[PDB]
């Protein structure tokens, strides 16, 4: 058997940051070469592990997290960064052991009229804990007066839409991000490299 990395990387549809998608890779052999020898990736940052050595290690589980963010926000995905995406949408643990891979998807996720279907969270009472997902659509209370399920003064919708257009600059252009977390539990290892 073989791990379904291609399905995560080459997936026809990607998820929004607030509803980032999690894929569990287990009980398979993983050839990381296709990722680390590829040149289509604009961002490739591995924390706690070297990409070249990865084929030799074995892990208990692998988690692939998929989402789409603007280019300037990609820095936030890396651990220890503040930002709307990092604080309200997707947070990486300070003790992160894994790889962050990102590539330009302007040819894929942009339209002439503009793609506003990719969303992010603009407002939240508390900052997200590592690997926490908020799918809530509840109206944000900025004041004492309850919204009662209606957007109003001092009462705002928490989510906002990316505007993705082909001419927009590279930071402003959509980027697809996959985060591979290599989890080592006190249990039999089910994901291994070629060796």
């Amino acid at each position, epitope marked *: 058997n073989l791990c379904p990395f291609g399905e995560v990387f080459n997936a026809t549809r990607f998820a929004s940051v607030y509803a980032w998608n999690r894929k569990r890779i287990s009980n398979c052999v993983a050839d990381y070469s296709v990722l680390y020898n590829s040149a289509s990736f604009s961002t490739f*940052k*591995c924390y706690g592990v070297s990409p*070249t*050595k990865l084929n030799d290690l074995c892990f208990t589980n692998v988690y692939a997290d998929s989402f789409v963010i603007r280019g300037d926000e990609v820095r936030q995905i*890396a651990p220890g960064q503040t930002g709307k995406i990092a604080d309200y949408n997707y947070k990486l643990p300070d003790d*992160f052991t894994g790889c962050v891979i990102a590539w330009n998807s302007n040819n894929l996720d942009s339209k002439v009229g503009g793609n506003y279907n990719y969303l992010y969270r603009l407002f939240r009472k508390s900052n997200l804990k590592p690997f926490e997902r908020d799918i809530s659509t509840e109206i944000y209370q900025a004041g004492s007066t309850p919204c009662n399920g209606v957007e109003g003064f001092n009462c705002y919708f928490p989510l906002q839409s990316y505007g993705f257009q082909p001419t927009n600059g590279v930071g402003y252009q959509p980027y697809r991000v996959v985060v591979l977390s290599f989890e080592l539990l006190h249990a039999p290892a089910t994901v291994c490299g070629p060796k």
Partner: antibody
Amino acid sequence: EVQLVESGGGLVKPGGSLRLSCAASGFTFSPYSMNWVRQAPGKGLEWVSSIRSSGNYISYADSVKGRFTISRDNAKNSLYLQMNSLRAEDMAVYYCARAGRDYYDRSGYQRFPGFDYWGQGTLVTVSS
Amino acid sequence: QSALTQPPSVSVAPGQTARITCGGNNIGSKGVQWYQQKPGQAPVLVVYDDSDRPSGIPERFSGSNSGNTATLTISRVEAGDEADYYCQVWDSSSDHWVFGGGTKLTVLG
């Protein structure tokens, strides 16, 4: 969110010995490498020392030699610098700062980001 | 990498782009980090990893690194932009963090 507060310092006599502390809030201490930086009056920035938790990796500046020791308590989220045998050149504002996690590129080369969070600083004065 | 060279001073018009150059051998391998220090204030990181900019720093601030020589570019300069600017690199050989001498931005007129 993240604030680093530096205590200690003050007046030290020539040849005197001074410990410093850096308390940290908002981030888990051990994964991040923590360093000490000093700026002399009317002078440029100088790096005193760095600590790394993984192997207790310790690096010191060439000018600090056998007189300075860097200590970290990860449970307390605190950083310590013991300064012995102090001279006039060691008179500076000392900053405790957190450093971004080193990462390996796709080729496998290790790249080190630099000092995302600094502190207000504390002044050590070396007068008799 | 054990030595980083920076211009002593650079003067810029109020609306024009400013470039500060940090030079050392094989600086791109490990990373150039730039700091802005205003008088009476602690250093602030303006760009890291030769190109990445911390949150809350204006988009005008950008950095590049071209082999030995690295440049920090302020697209539109302002009175507030004036500060001492320092560059930083890491030595695996000596295990030392190396800082630049500093560059003083002075906005004319």
